[PDB]
Design a protein around this motif. Structure first.
Motif, PDB file in Angstrom:
ATOM      1  N   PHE A 252       0.835  -1.196   0.000  1.00 25.31           N
ATOM      2  CA  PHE A 252       0.000   0.000   0.000  1.00 25.31           C
ATOM      3  C   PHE A 252       0.878   1.257   0.000  1.00 25.31           C
ATOM      4  CE2 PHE A 252      -3.459  -2.714   2.027  1.00 25.31           C
ATOM      5  CZ  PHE A 252      -4.409  -2.522   1.031  1.00 25.31           C
ATOM      6  N   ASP A 253       1.660   1.429   1.064  1.00 24.42           N
ATOM      7  CA  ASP A 253       2.258   2.728   1.378  1.00 24.42           C
ATOM      8  C   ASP A 253       3.753   2.675   1.744  1.00 24.42           C
ATOM      9  OD1 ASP A 253      -0.426   4.217   1.257  1.00 24.42           O
ATOM     10  OD2 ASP A 253      -0.823   2.854   2.929  1.00 24.42           O
ATOM     11  N   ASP A 254       4.596   2.282   0.787  1.00 21.53           N
ATOM     12  CA  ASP A 254       6.052   2.303   0.982  1.00 21.53           C
ATOM     13  C   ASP A 254       6.669   3.657   0.620  1.00 21.53           C
ATOM     14  OD1 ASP A 254       6.914  -0.090   2.186  1.00 21.53           O
ATOM     15  OD2 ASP A 254       6.806  -1.181   0.284  1.00 21.53           O
ATOM     16  N   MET A 255       6.305   4.168  -0.554  1.00 17.22           N
ATOM     17  CA  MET A 255       6.742   5.482  -1.019  1.00 17.22           C
ATOM     18  C   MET A 255       6.074   6.601  -0.226  1.00 17.22           C
ATOM     19  SD  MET A 255       4.785   3.419  -2.691  1.00 17.22           S
ATOM     20  CE  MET A 255       3.003   3.302  -2.749  1.00 17.22           C
ATOM     21  N   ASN A 256       5.911   6.370   1.078  1.00 15.91           N
ATOM     22  CA  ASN A 256       5.299   7.323   2.009  1.00 15.91           C
ATOM     23  C   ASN A 256       4.551   8.461   1.328  1.00 15.91           C
ATOM     24  OD1 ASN A 256       5.764   6.231   4.629  1.00 15.91           O
ATOM     25  ND2 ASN A 256       7.913   6.881   4.536  1.00 15.91           N
ATOM     26  N   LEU A 257       3.524   8.090   0.569  1.00 16.67           N
ATOM     27  CA  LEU A 257       2.763   9.027  -0.250  1.00 16.67           C
ATOM     28  C   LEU A 257       2.051  10.068   0.607  1.00 16.67           C
ATOM     29  CD1 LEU A 257       1.553   5.851  -0.509  1.00 16.67           C
ATOM     30  CD2 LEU A 257       1.628   6.534  -2.894  1.00 16.67           C
ATOM     31  N   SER A 258       1.816  11.244   0.035  1.00 14.51           N
ATOM     32  CA  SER A 258       1.086  12.293   0.738  1.00 14.51           C
ATOM     33  C   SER A 258      -0.425  12.054   0.726  1.00 14.51           C
ATOM     34  CB  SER A 258       1.429  13.669   0.168  1.00 14.51           C
ATOM     35  OG  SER A 258       2.669  14.118   0.677  1.00 14.51           O
ATOM     36  N   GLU A 259      -1.156  12.921   1.422  1.00 15.48           N
ATOM     37  CA  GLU A 259      -2.612  12.811   1.537  1.00 15.48           C
ATOM     38  C   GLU A 259      -3.342  13.214   0.256  1.00 15.48           C
ATOM     39  OE1 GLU A 259      -2.297  14.251   6.119  1.00 15.48           O
ATOM     40  OE2 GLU A 259      -4.179  14.731   5.100  1.00 15.48           O
ATOM     41  N   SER A 260      -2.779  14.178  -0.475  1.00 16.91           N
ATOM     42  CA  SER A 260      -3.337  14.603  -1.758  1.00 16.91           C
ATOM     43  C   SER A 260      -3.117  13.522  -2.814  1.00 16.91           C
ATOM     44  CB  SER A 260      -2.733  15.943  -2.198  1.00 16.91           C
ATOM     45  OG  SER A 260      -1.435  16.123  -1.657  1.00 16.91           O
ATOM     46  N   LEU A 261      -3.453  12.289  -2.440  1.00 15.85           N
ATOM     47  CA  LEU A 261      -3.068  11.098  -3.186  1.00 15.85           C
ATOM     48  C   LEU A 261      -3.947   9.900  -2.835  1.00 15.85           C
ATOM     49  CD1 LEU A 261       0.565   9.987  -3.852  1.00 15.85           C
ATOM     50  CD2 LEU A 261      -1.215   8.290  -3.314  1.00 15.85           C
ATOM     51  N   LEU A 262      -4.030   9.583  -1.544  1.00 19.82           N
ATOM     52  CA  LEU A 262      -4.864   8.477  -1.075  1.00 19.82           C
ATOM     53  C   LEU A 262      -6.357   8.821  -1.116  1.00 19.82           C
ATOM     54  CD1 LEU A 262      -4.060   5.556  -0.100  1.00 19.82           C
ATOM     55  CD2 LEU A 262      -2.091   7.125  -0.006  1.00 19.82           C
ATOM     56  N   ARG A 263      -6.672  10.087  -1.399  1.00 19.85           N
ATOM     57  CA  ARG A 263      -8.056  10.503  -1.636  1.00 19.85           C
ATOM     58  C   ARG A 263      -8.571   9.987  -2.982  1.00 19.85           C
ATOM     59  NH1 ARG A 263      -8.532  17.003  -3.373  1.00 19.85           N
ATOM     60  NH2 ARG A 263      -6.454  17.158  -4.325  1.00 19.85           N
ATOM     61  N   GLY A 264      -7.661   9.841  -3.944  1.00 20.68           N
ATOM     62  CA  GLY A 264      -8.013   9.411  -5.297  1.00 20.68           C
ATOM     63  C   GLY A 264      -7.930   7.912  -5.543  1.00 20.68           C
TER      64      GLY A 264
END
Lengths: 351, 284, 343
Positions: free
Chosen positions: A10-22
């Protein structure tokens, strides 16, 4: 291919929040081999078939590396059609597609005063607009070449070269393409320094009944309903008016049914999908047109009430794998179905 | 002379589209008893015209209802309307079905209360009234959209019309159904904008891969030509638009000048444009 | 090999096709034409008190028009023609039909079939059968009914079919009903914008309209012009505000007193679209659109010209409201409307 290191999580590239919304509205394809590679600012080059996956991969990168305070990204696609889908898909996580319709003076008037956000287009149009300084090569640190093979064989060579000689040297360059002839190799050469070569290549029961009158079709469809009696199935008919016709004819006959036509906009269009997954809307009637956005995954049954008139569409209807396909044929349709059993050495058996 | 008074008012409305001008006119007439007359007339007139008029009439009724008359008045009118079906259906074969759509829309818009239809339960020995009612019923159930009528008409925006014309064409490429396309073209009711059809169908071929679109669009136009569904003028202005815009189309389609010419030739060949028009095609 | 008789636009002196079935391609509204009327009139035996021609039309309205025009021409001969209309006066209608078997009956296929099928009207002497605007009639469903009427007619009946478009359901009627027909193409000019200069005036709002109009009457020193408004209450207001500024102006609202005004002596005329339907609007060099039509198709019925038959000037007055429309009308027709200078 030189980089086989993958990121499945799911979340290795420590993605930002303006991202997991989509992502809400399991990344596995070319999209895990390239997941992080770009998110820093690297040049990559992937060999991949464009499904909705490939064109989702980089769509992510671009929006992650943004700065919502300043256009800064450039994406080229072989056609105006593919350019708009990209634009939607992209805006669908929060970017302006290039038309040259009779509406261009309002379009570009739009683009002078305050417009440049992110941009995607064909090589030809985009160039014209860079030149006419409608588009500013300034702070644009991202350069995506989508379906290069196609862009190239469409005679876009010059324009692609010219558009780069218009941009800073620092810029990120990502090229995607299903195949790699010498012209595609050549551009990686002249555009990128030290690239990441990826490769994810190579990437269901079917029957037919025989209604003798085409009016028998509604009838053999309410036979099947008793005998299907699932809380899910998708029915492909060929025209908006036929979709509406048959939807009425169902209520008429006291079967609950769901209708996806085409003058239903995207607002209440998706109203069904979410409820269709629930098993709520028993059956879903659609044209393979506004299969624009459809989910033929959780669909264990597909009825071609009209045969697709184009083989290549036949594959976009049928959809791990687990589903069935039933085809209705008429005594004047039959001539030309055995024609589908020629591009396909995979059989379609009698009912 | 009450039909003579009212018909012009309603026909004019059909031209302008402004229900306020109709309202006032009626207020300034003081009908009372004969208020329920108006929706009977309007519906009759709309039953003899096109969908666009039928749309306009549903709308007029929505607005008239509240401000110049009551749902009580409305409900009487439809009672009348169904009383009449047998006669109406002589000048409007699909009248039962169509009155059923007015009914259905009028519930939808609450100018007919929500028990109008069931008020007819176990009554009719009129087959056509009952068919009207069934249609309205069915329609009403499956709308638990935007319009039972179309959305054609010169009262629509070029934008909307463009979206349809596009729909229509995208649809034909998957259907193959020339007749379905002729129909959709007709329902737009916008014969001086047919040049858009032509235009967009050519642009589709220009931007297309292979031989399919080519063939299909050429078949479409040939058929439309052969029946006169599209006029020579409207076909002309269609090509002339491409002719003039082929520079810009060429931005997105390098090969554009090449197919354009190949296509335009096959037209002249199949009898559908003149030499004048074929010869006026840009060369590379 | 496939013959045609070709004819150019519209304009008893008329030829008279006896006997031959005829497939005529002609634009809608020829049924309203003096030519249509004569075609049929001159073939009636005025002394057979029977129905001799049957004209089908796609709607009661079109039917009355056809009858209006026939009768305008028919009272001279002594020829009689009824349009079946139904309505509050059916019984009298039906009594007349029987009692006086008029020479020429016109109506929708449904009503005509109904009249035939319950004996109010006889097939016996119908030597001619015309299907006006067959494409419209098929579209509204009148087909079973056309078939049913045809079946009642004598094998020697002349069948004539007039239609603007000629789809295959219309050809099926042709193939099925007709023997050896003569095909006739009748061409008319498309309306067009070419040969009309179109200018606009960006007035601010309605209030401003009235003045900007009278200035124009001065400036352009106009002798004769048609002015278009979207309603007849407004068409009347404006003709008043116009003897209160005194201008030789006449608003549109009797066939003789109106034909006289068709050219008073180069006059000025105020109308709606619907009422200018009753006037030959393309003889006039200047059209001014006080309101601009809210239906875009109405635009070219207002200012459009005959491709050579007709060349003029048209003036549109807009607002912040209506700016958006005038551009839509411009996009619609693929045309230019320029802003009006003093020069």
């Amino acid at each position: 291919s030189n980089w086989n290191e993958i990121v499945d999580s799911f979340d290795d590239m420590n993605l930002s929040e303006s991202l997991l919304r989509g992502i809400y509205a399991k990344p596995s394809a070319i999209q895990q081999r390239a997941i992080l590679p770009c998110i820093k600012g690297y040049d990559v080059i992937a060999q991949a078939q464009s499904g909705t996956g490939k064109t989702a991969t980089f769509a992510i990168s671009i929006l992650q590396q943004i700065e919502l305070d300043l256009t800064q990204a450039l994406v080229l696609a072989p056609t105006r059609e593919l350019a708009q889908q990209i634009q939607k898909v992209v805006m669908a996580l929060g970017c302006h597609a290039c038309i040259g319709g009779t509406n261009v003076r309002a379009e570009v008037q739009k683009l002078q005063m305050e417009a440049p956000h992110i941009i995607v287009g064909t090589p030809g149009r985009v160039f014209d607009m860079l030149n006419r300084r409608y588009l500013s090569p300034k702070y644009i640190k991202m350069f995506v070449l989508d379906e290069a093979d196609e862009m190239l064989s469409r005679g876009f060579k010059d324009q692609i070269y010219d558009i780069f000689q218009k941009l800073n040297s620092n810029t990120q360059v990502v090229l995607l393409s299903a195949t790699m002839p010498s012209d595609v190799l050549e551009v990686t050469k002249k555009f990128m320094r030290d690239p990441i070569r990826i490769l994810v290549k190579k990437e269901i029961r079917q029957f037919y009944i025989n209604v003798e009158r085409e009016e028998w079709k509604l009838d053999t469809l309410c036979d099947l309903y008793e005998t299907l009696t699932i809380t899910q199935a998708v029915i492909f008919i060929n025209t908006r008016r036929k979709v509406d016709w048959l939807t009425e004819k169902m209520h008429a006959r006291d079967f609950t049914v769901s209708a996806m036509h085409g003058d239903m906009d995207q607002k209440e269009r998706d109203v069904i999908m979410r409820e269709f997954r629930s098993g709520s809307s028993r059956v879903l009637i659609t044209t393979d047109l506004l299969a624009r956005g459809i989910d033929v995954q959780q669909v264990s049954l597909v009825i071609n009430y009209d045969l697709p008139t184009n083989r290549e569409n036949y594959i976009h209807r049928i959809g791990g794998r687990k589903g069935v396909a039933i085809n209705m044929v008429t005594e004047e349709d039959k001539r030309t179905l055995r024609d589908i059993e020629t591009f396909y050495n995979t059989s379609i058996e009698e009912m | 002379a009450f039909e003579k008074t009212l018909t012009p008012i309603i026909q004019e409305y059909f031209e302008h589209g402004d229900t306020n001008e109709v309202a006032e006119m009626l207020r300034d007439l003081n009908l009372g008893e004969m208020k329920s007359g108006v929706p009977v007339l309007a519906v009759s007139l709309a039953l003899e015209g096109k969908a666009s008029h039928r749309e306009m009439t549903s709308k007029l009724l929505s607005d008239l209802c509240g401000t110049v008359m009551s749902t009580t008045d409305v409900e009487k009118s439809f009672d009348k309307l169904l009383k009449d079906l047998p006669e109406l259906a002589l000048d409007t074969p699909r009248a039962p079905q169509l009155v059923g759509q007015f009914i259905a829309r009028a519930v939808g818009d609450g100018i007919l209360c929500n028990t109008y239809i069931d008020s007819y339960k176990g009554t009719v020995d009129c087959v056509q009234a009952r068919a009207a009612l069934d249609k309205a019923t069915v329609l009403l159930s499956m709308s638990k959209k935007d319009s039972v009528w179309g959305s054609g008409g010169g009262q629509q925006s070029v934008n909307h019309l463009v979206k349809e014309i596009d729909m229509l064409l995208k649809e034909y490429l998957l259907s193959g159904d020339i007749s379905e396309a002729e129909h959709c073209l007709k329902e737009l009711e916008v014969p001086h904008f047919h040049h858009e059809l032509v235009y967009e169908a050519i642009i589709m071929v220009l931007e297309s891969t292979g031989e399919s679109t080519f063939k299909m669009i050429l078949d479409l136009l040939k058929s439309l030509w052969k029946s006169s569904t599209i006029t020579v003028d409207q076909m002309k202005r269609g090509y002339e638009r491409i002719y003039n815009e082929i520079p810009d189309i060429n931005l997105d389609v390098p090969h554009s000048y090449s197919v354009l010419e190949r296509f335009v030739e096959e037209c002249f060949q199949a009898g559908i444009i003149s030499k004048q028009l074929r010869d006026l095609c840009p060369s590379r």
